[PDB]
Design a binder for these strands. Sequence first.
DNA 1: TGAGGTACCTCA
DNA 2: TGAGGTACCTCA
Lengths: 142, 142
Amino acid sequence: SWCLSVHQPWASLLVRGIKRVEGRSWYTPHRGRLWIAATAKKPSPQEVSELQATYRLLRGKDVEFPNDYPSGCLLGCVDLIDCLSQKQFKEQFPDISQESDSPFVFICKNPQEMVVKFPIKGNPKIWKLDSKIHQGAKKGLM
Amino acid sequence: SWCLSVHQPWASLLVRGIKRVEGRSWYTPHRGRLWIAATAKKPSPQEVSELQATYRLLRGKDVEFPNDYPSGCLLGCVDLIDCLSQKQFKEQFPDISQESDSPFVFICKNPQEMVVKFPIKGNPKIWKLDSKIHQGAKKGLM
DNA sequence: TGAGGTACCTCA
DNA sequence: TGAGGTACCTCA
């Protein structure tokens, strides 16, 4: 039921598995499924192209990006398997530690992207999905 | 007929004779009567009080300020008796040269303040009053 | 967060 | 100029 709001284009990159961690200033004890919602902040087309070029160099020239980075909607989910300090992050993930310098680094696995994305209004930190949205989101994962 | 738009509170200080020069980046050959309009930009109350305190120290503790600094209206007129370079301004007006560091300094005399101020839309540089406004403004000078 | 008030920027 | 589009800031 719990959800995290993330700015595009990073939000869709997370549920695609292209972005593997998300950094925040705060720790969460939450583990397991964490839904990912895009915030309402629309990224400029310049931001999107520049971030895609960067991720092409980190992951490979043939990485398959989403066609669109919709804002203000529920995108999918990840498994939040750990929430590491920056010191722990460098120790455990040397190969990607450069990908977040935040005080706490959310380590994400098993991303799933919803085929039908639903409009939603987010909140700070981890918040709970409304039950109707949650129900439809689970169906749309099949 | 010619008019200059000036930000408040400087605009009303000009037609009161409290402010004696107005600086601009450009020269004008205009001499004689120059109407003064306030721009549409409303000054914060903090700006007004700070500028009044400064002019109190330059002119005297008992200087009589206007009760209000209305925006977007025709305030009065001055006689533009010269348009001096900054070098000329320092040479001719040593006692007030510190009051403008602009490339050109408009030297104003014989300020008159209209008792009824009329709403107006300004333009850059020196512009011409509409004839109906001009007619009423001259009457209101009596 | 998302929303909106506002200061800043630009103007065939 | 004055007007408005927009980025920035703040939020009992």
